[PDB]
């Protein structure tokens, strides 16, 4: 083993990486960013806060939520506590990461989680919608990013020097393209 979590992300990089305009080419990475939500009846921590980062495909299944999945387990596991994670990623699960996620749960059943996207990942291709297909079937929350998404990210996962976020052209419009697409997806 050998990853552990960045603490966050510099603002060049955000918002390169998370444009969900119809860049589907040169973002070549995926970009994971999470909170980690202990709970022993009375809500007390852990809380934890993090980035991981991937190459699209060399290498791969080493893959950015694999990469969580691993750490998540040593570093942080407690027995009988109510977990909450949290992640929002650049790119969407493939359907191995999907399939290696559903495996997870089963074997954790005090641990939730949801999934916000910036962008939909070769989404023409069935094997791909079958994932998140099969992660809506599991239990698991696959939301697309809107605006109070990037920001709660700049808010918490971005180096942002005191500046409030700042959308770029037309966040708003992709949005709902996304959503759309993956509510039919979905159906
Ligand atoms: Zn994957």
């Known amino acids: 083993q050998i990853r552990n979590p960045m603490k966050a992300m510099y603002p060049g990089t955000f918002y390169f990486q998370f444009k969900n305009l119809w860049e589907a080419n040169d973002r070549n990475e995926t970009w994971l960013c999470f909170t980690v939500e202990g709970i022993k009846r009375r809500s ?5 806060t993090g980035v991981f980062r991937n190459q699209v495909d060399s290498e791969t299944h080493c893959h950015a939520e694999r990469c969580f999945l691993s750490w998540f387990c040593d570093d942080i596991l407690s027995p009988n506590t109510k977990y909450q994670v949290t992640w929002y990623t650049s790119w969407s699960p493939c359907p191995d990461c999907a399939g290696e996620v559903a495996e997870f749960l ?8 949801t999934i916000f996207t910036a962008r939909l990942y070769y989404f023409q291709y069935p094997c791909y919608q079958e994932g998140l297909r099969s992660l809506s079937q599991e239990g698991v929350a696959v939301e697309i990013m809107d605006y109070e998404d990037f920001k709660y990210c700049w808010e918490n996962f971005v180096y942002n ?3 409030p976020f700042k959308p770029w ?10 959503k759309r697409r993956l509510r039919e997806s979905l159906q």
């Open 44 to 48: 007390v921590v852990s809380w934890k």
């Open 106 to 113: 089963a074997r954790h059943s005090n641990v939730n989680l």
């Open 161 to 163: 020097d005191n500046e």
């Open 169 to 178: 052209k037309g966040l708003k419009t992709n949005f709902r393209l996304l």
